[PDB]
Amino acid sequence: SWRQKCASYVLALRPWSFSASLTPVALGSALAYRSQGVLDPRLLVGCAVAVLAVHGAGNLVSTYYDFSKGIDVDRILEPQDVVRFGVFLYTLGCVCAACLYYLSTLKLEHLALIYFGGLSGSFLYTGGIGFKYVALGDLIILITFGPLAVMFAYAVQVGSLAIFPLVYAIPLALSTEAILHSNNTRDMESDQEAGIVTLAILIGPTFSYVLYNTLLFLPYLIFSILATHCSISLALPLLTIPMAFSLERQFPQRTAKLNLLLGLFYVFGIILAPAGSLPRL
Amino acid sequence: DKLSRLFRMHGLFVASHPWEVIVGTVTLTICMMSMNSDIIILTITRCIAILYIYFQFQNLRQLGSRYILGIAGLFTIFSSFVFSTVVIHFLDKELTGLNEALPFFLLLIDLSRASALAKFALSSNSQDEVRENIARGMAILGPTFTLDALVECLVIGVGTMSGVRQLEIMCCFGCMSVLANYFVFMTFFPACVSLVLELSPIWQLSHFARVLEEEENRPNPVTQRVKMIMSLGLVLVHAHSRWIA
């Protein structure tokens, strides 16, 4: 039944999935709403599914690397069920993108450029980097997946491309990196004994701690700047600083929850912003 | 199983007659040029720089054989020559500055797959054996490299229809670089390898190769399927955007 394959479907997710895939889309649509004043639900759902599907396909590209050793769901898995699901997810993504073209007023070339350059660019280098350096390749993915999802959603919504969504989507990329780094630090010794290398293993424990703290606290500086210099109504994400201090004092579920709340308040900040008070908006 | 036979045929037929294929292809290139001296300067500069970064980033003489570096150099010369001649002679001379980061990086990248075939070839002992090894190396490395080149050419290709001029030019150079690399790797790289190994038998890399080549060289099965779907999608984008638009 469906519940017996929900375990198969949870294989393509990670603790940083909701944030990295679904927060950008909401931000992008909020920016599109602020810029133009008309939002479309159909395109919003389409962008959400397309970005989530592509991210899932990439997670399965990584999941397949856990068959080298018995790292491994309440069933027997083997390397056909992963391949089939990867193909199905990516095909779903492409069908969604085709639907978005048909519904939206964006040019096919720009849509293809974003969707096959940015979102699906991970597949071009990942695969044949080995099983050891799968975690190191993830940083570059999560740096270049956060902003591109925002802009993809924004462009599809409005009908023309723009540069500023990449600038507005820095905090989300940083907080997502903090989640990934935190989860890497959590599995330091296991990865060390297994032969896997991550950033936390390479830089050491104290540098991983300072890097964690940097990646956690940069968003709040960016929100304070963007508050005091552009629009005061954007200052909501500073309200969750007690949680950030609690996280810093207790050093990934709580980090993931923090990111979720940061993202929510950042979207509520963007929506409530006055008309004309935001750069290029 | 179907494609491997065809690539094995190609590898064998190229490696069997090295000199005739290499002179024929060089003739074809200079014919394409002449029918329609800065080429040498750009070839040399580009070659030295690319070969030097590869020479550095890869650990010098880690295996204990310089033939790999010689073969890599002879690959780089031809790749850079074939790229440079088109850039200088045909496209635009004045527009070749500061956006040669992508072609510069793609060759660094494509050198590994050229070195692989050299490692496949060097483990031989006899002349018929080295020809057979080149054939098997080609049969293994051909399909994957073809797919990689195709998808890269189509992605960077769709980059050339954006509207932003700088992106159009950079992407155009990217596509030319990929096609030059693939053309050189297929046509007259194995001829060069075969000829170098024929005209010169202290090549001892048998056991490591014959245990790890058919295991360590294997890509990720998910990536390959996604690349095939990307390829198909981009072919539809290109067909529509160029003919129906």
Partner: antibody, heavy 118, light 106 residues
Framework: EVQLQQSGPELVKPGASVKMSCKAS????????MNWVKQSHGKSLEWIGR????????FYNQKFKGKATLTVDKSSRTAHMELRSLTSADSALYFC?????????????WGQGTTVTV | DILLTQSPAILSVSPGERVSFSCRAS??????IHWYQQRTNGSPRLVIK???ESISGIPSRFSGSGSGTDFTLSINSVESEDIADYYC?????????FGGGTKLEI
């Protein structure tokens, strides 16, 4: 229709090494694992290990880590097992077993046994 | 190495009568059990996957039950084609471990 055709009996001497073949046929050989099972005299089954046919990344049971080495031949659709340093307690059947087609199946397709005799 | 145990070693029955085996694990293994049937001079064949779910090509008289640690297989009415050894396998944690095996008798 999947069928796993396995090699015939093997009468051998002590201290030697022995190679077994299980020619897989009727499906995409490179998709599923190729497990191995030992049935001793007394009829008590034991799990040896597996091998991913695409890469070749094996994964053994700890007991059989030293004296069982699984190899694969992608060209001819054949999975191999090499037993080394045989003793009196290796006279046993060896099955090559594989999981079902759909997700969530257990080990349907077994071989037929290679009656090794030390 | 989860130790699986089984409780008649040899089990005598009469044609028509209901039979019941038991595969008592050494750990909470969920619904991860598989009951194989091995006749004289053959390979084991699957009967009940995951302690409950039936198999296509098996007669309907074979049914399983139980969860957690203690499992059970049952045959409604035995015939001359149900005289074999039955092994329970767990697929929860590597390495997989078969049971001792229960033989039947008329």
């Amino acid at each position: 229709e999947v069928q796993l055709q396995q090699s015939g009996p093997e009468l051998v001497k002590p201290g030697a090494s022995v190679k077994m073949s299980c020619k897989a046929s009727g499906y995409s050989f490179t998709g599923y694992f190729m497990n191995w099972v030992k049935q001793s005299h007394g009829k008590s089954l034991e799990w040896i290990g597996r091998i991913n046919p695409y890469n070749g990344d094996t994964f053994y049971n700890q007991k059989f880590k030293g004296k069982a080495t699984l190899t694969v031949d992608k060209s001819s659709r054949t999975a191999h097992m090499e037993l080394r340093s045989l003793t009196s307690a290796d006279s046993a059947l060896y099955f090559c077993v594989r999981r079902g087609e759909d997700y969530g199946s257990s080990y349907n397709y077994w071989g037929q046994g290679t009656t090794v005799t030390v | 190495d989860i130790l699986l145990t089984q409780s008649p070693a040899i089990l005598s029955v009469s044609p028509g009568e209901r039979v019941s085996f038991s595969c008592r694990a050494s750990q909470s293994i969920g619904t991860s059990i598989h009951w194989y049937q091995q006749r004289t001079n053959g390979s084991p064949r699957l009967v009940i996957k995951y302690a409950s779910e039936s198999i296509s090509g098996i007669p309907s008289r074979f049914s399983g039950s139980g969860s957690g640690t203690d499992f059970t297989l049952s045959i409604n009415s035995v015939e001359s084609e149900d005289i074999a050894d039955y092994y329970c396998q767990q697929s929860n944690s590597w390495p997989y471990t078969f049971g001792g095996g229960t033989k039947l008798e008329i």
